[PDB]
Amino acid sequence: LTNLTPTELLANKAVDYLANSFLVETPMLGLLANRVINQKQKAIEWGAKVA
């Protein structure tokens, strides 16, 4: 009965869920991620047609 098996000894498993209800949407990053490119050099070189 209740007095046996007390609260302290009743280590009850909880569902392995965190509820991280923060930042469901990274719009700009999500658009640019999966097309980010990591390069070994610290500067970004490219050609821009001007005329």
Add this chain to the structure above:
Amino acid sequence: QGVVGGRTRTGALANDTQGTIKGASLSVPDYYIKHQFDVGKDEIVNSDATGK
């Protein structure tokens, strides 16, 4: 250097000074000739990637 004395054949056996070994002692100094540099880890991969 030890000093040589003089005495006659039958002269009294006096005693004279002796060569003095003195203990000389240096030491590997407690002071280093270090030269050390904080090469940024970005300027390592960067320079390897774009290094003429």
